From a paper:
Dynein-2 is a large multiprotein complex that powers retrograde intraflagellar transport (IFT) of cargoes within cilia/flagella, but the molecular mechanism underlying this function is still emerging. Distinctively, dynein-2 contains two identical force-generating heavy chains that interact with two different intermediate chains (WDR34 and WDR60). Dynein-2 is the essential motor for retrograde intraflagellar transport (IFT), the conserved process in which polymeric IFT “trains” translocate cargoes along the ciliary microtubules. A 3.9 Å resolution structure shows how WDR34 and WDR60 use surprisingly different interactions to engage equivalent sites of the two heavy chains.
The WDR34 and WDR60 β-propeller domains each engage a copy of DYNC2H1, principally at bundles 3 and 4. Notably, a loop from bundle 3 of DYNC2H1 positions a lysine residue (K477) directly into the pore of the WDR34 β-propeller domain, whose mouth is lined by highly conserved residues (bottom row). In contrast, WDR34 uses a classic β-propeller mode interaction to engage DYNC2H1, accommodating a lysine side chain within its central pore. Lacking the insert in its third blade, the WDR34 β-propeller allows the associated copy of DYNC2H1 to adopt a bent conformation. In contrast, the copy of DYNC2H1 associated with WDR34 is bent. These straight and bent conformers of DYNC2H1 represent extreme ends of the range of heavy chain conformations observed in other dyneins. The only notable shared interaction that WDR34 and WDR60 use to engage DYNC2H1 involves E355 (WDR34)/D881 (WDR60) contacting R587 of DYNC2H1. DYNC2H1 mutation R587C is associated with severe short-rib thoracic dysplasia. The regions of WDR34 and WDR60 N-proximal to the β-propeller domains are held together by a tower of dimeric light chains (one DYNLRB1 homodimer and three DYNLL1 homodimers). Our data suggest that, in the case of WDR34, the binding of the IC and its associated light chains can partially stabilize the asymmetry of DYNC2H1, sufficient for a minimal level of attachment to anterograde IFT trains and transport into cilia in the absence of WDR60.
Residue numbers in the entry:
A (entry chain D): 81 to 536
B (entry chain B): 395 to 654, 668 to 693
C (entry chain C): 551 to 569, 575 to 611
D (entry chain J), E (entry chain I): 4 to 89
F (entry chain H), G (entry chain G): 3 to 95
Amino acid sequence: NHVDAQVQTEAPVPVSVQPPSQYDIPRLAAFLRRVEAMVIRELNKNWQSHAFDGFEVNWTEQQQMVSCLYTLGYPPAQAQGLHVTSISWNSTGSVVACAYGRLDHGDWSTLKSFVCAWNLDRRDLRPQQPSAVVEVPSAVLCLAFHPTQPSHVAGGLYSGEVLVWDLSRLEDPLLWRTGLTDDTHTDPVSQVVWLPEPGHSHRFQVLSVATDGKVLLWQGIGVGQLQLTEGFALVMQQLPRSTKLKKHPRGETEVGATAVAFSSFDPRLFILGTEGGFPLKCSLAAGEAALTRMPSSVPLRAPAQFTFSPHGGPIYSVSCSPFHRNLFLSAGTDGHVHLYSMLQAPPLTSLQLSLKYLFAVRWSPVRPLVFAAASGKGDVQLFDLQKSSQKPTVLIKQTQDESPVYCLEFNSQQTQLLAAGDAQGTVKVWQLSTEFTEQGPREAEDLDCLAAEVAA
Amino acid sequence: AEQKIAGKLKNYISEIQDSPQQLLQAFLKYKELVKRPTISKELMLERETLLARLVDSIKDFRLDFENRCRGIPGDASGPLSGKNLSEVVNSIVWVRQLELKVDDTIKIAEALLSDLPGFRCFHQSAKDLLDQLKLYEQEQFDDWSRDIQSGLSDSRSGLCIEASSRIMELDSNDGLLKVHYSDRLVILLREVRQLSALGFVIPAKIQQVANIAQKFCKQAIILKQVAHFYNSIDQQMIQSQRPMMLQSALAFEQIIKNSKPKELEGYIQKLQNAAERLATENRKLR
Amino acid sequence: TREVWTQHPGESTVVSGGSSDAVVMPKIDTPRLCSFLRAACQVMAVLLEEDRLAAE
Amino acid sequence: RKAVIKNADMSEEMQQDSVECATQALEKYNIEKDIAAHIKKEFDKKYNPTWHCIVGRNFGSYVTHETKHFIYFYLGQVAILLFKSG
Amino acid sequence: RKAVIKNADMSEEMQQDSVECATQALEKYNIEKDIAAHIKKEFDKKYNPTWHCIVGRNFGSYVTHETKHFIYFYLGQVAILLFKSG
Amino acid sequence: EVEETLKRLQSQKGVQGIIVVNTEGIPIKSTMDNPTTTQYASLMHSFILKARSTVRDIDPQNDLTFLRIRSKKNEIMVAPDKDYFLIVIQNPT
Amino acid sequence: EVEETLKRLQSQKGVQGIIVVNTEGIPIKSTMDNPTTTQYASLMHSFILKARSTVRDIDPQNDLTFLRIRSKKNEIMVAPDKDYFLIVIQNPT
């Protein structure tokens, strides 16, 4: 007789450093005498040697230009003239996923909305045919993919609900959601991040941020329901502020927000971007109660503990460096991108990238000095801060009619890929030239020197 | 020391010279050097070159305003579009970006370029443009002040709410379910908040309606999920399809007909149990 | 029936197996690979000359 | 995840199907038993039963197979094994 | 090596035989090829055919198996998968 | 006694790494953080097990005494003995 | 040109090993017998694959550029590329 069996290797155990008194320390000392005699000779030779002056090796083809052939769209969404801004890449690097909703005048979304997923590894990949599709009866605009399970994606809605999909069961692709409760958002949402469960960090929770001026942390239990455990509000008087801001109006008014980026070496620290045009530093441990009129099952608090120098108007994107803990980039309505250190209130650098509106900023997963940005003129741009202090290194025109373009994300594991989305219901995927794809000489040291150059 | 430094400055300026953005950003980065009188006399053609770039930039900013100022909000011929902003809020953000670039153009030219005869002529033009942006923004706020106060008077449309006005209504003339909180009041909370966040003073009457509208906004969004679920499950079914689902819907519809905080939140709690059943059966017909 | 062994990572590019060569034609002949022998032997020669200058 | 391969005995449609089903398994799951579960379940459904599938990034194997049915492949930083026996 | 075990369907002698055959191979050979090779060859020699073996620090699987023959087990840092079908 | 030698090795020209690992595979104190120390100690321990086999596989009457790896970011040095091996890292020059 | 460069290395003080490898563990140039050439070629190819893997597990944004291996009887030196690699062997110093 035949039966079917499933088995899995558990996760690796982490090793620990050992304290010295436990072992025979004189044998470590005798070892270090022998080894230092050689290592002194060999480190002096390696400091001295000419043996690698201009030496190089190759492991990839030297593709000369940022170049592309993909076009991803859902024709039933495109026939309605719907606009797109969402990208996320899954943990297996197999999927890119996208979401349709018109932002055009912020008008009332009783209109149809779709979430689409494309698996770019498929030999059955086609331009006009998503690998999966799910509908929502009001506009969706976020996606974030779970840091381990590749099917699991979370997104926020116009009119305030949060939805979580699992693309591993496509006959029932969607059950983890707020419904509506006192805990919830109300005005348009667009951020998601996935964050580990405190003390149980192999599990994950969904974070949401909204034009409400709330920040919320969520988990799913049972049929059609999420439950909450951290809640913050940007009550306008309460946050500490820089001198470009006047004495603030009624604290019973929030400041609305949409950005999140975490300082990846110390997960308490996150950065927010605001409707008021000022970046904020936020801590997951700020205890000051908000005094918001509205009820919630957990009471709201101020999330923030610092304010940075402002943009010329609303902020729509922020991203933090995966190489230096203190660094973030912001993009907003004023045609500029700014760099900040989390130690200082002025920007470390300011650049103008268009005469028109912008919203994307992302850092390369490979290169400490590469950032990318995208523009309402219909263009995508890449900047190599090791090659120039002032000039953008690459510019790409995505829409032939100059209809607006706004998304950026870099792939999780095929790190040569960058994807961008636009007003003609479409996403395109760009493979970068090799100079972007592989790390340059001394780039980590040059990023430390960049931050140090205006330590003030 | 300045003469040898100015030689290297004039070389660096000649490397960047093709780009007006790089030229202007170098003139900002090294502004305090360019201010000094001997360096200013060494860089005279470079000062006149930046004046020509900035004069053309003031032409382009006014030409963009001349096309846009009576064009449709958000459209490519009119004011630019941000994420989820309204007609008035897009218009204000767009005007302040024109003010910002004209003001920076004036300030940088004032410190660096104000010896030149063309600077007097073009400074007058740039200041006059900047005052015309202020004036046209004030004309939009004068119209907004009238038109918000007249709109708020029509509370029966849902542009403002009496607490003694109706929660939700199954209008037997139509069979449709209606919620008396207008979509324009949800936009008014976004408008008043975004104005406050950027830094505007809010009129007392507008703040009073916003207080009433905030607490009702939580309820109105719940009521609009119910109303859109009822209107969509009705529109999915021609009468040839209804009576079978209508038995399950009659549990949810008893709560809707009972529309004819503690009352409403207990009503919503019962309605969410009915919604688990009805939403499961809605997917089966789809 | 046929028997196969297979591994990740591999003990070579012969990743799996069952119970002169054509690859040499491009590999010996390629002028880029001949240049990589100029470079790699230049590295070996300066390493030997540095080790002799330290020894002598 | 780009592919790298060295083994050869199955018909070309079966090579196409096995890489495609594993690709769909990479959108479907990361927990490797579930990736292998998709790959095997579609192969048992389309082809004659019974099939065996394994997914790992640190393993060795030795297995025996029916004529014209075996594949082994690398996708990115992971390896996949799929064969019929019984 | 320390032995740790979980998921199985076989008589206790066959469980112990898998642990001993793997242990003796792990002493005899440093390379996983020869471990998986010896485990199959001894199972084919003592038992009736047909057997398949996997030996790894990381794998997940889905497989078909015959009643009273399946095991998965650890010997230190390494896991082993061993099943009958064919 | 020992920690003074660790400062002597930390002081070297163009250098920032030290890790010592014991023949059981377990790390000793480092100027790197614990995440980085764990990653380097475990990975290089696996690579040195292959290295010492490789020299013994060329000749069972020989044995291994030093190793280098040069990489695009940095050079790495390795030095094994009876109870311990050392890792050192030198920034690019 | 290149053959004279291999003869130059073959002549050096206490030197005799030169092998070039096709990235299938098999040799294309040698100053040694083919059986021993294949032993060193296949062992070094296994060891390069583990070395490159180890550097990418240490830092996925880095990559391997050189390997050096010192034994009580001799030192071995290795210079790798995608398609092709050189092995050289010398008495100790």
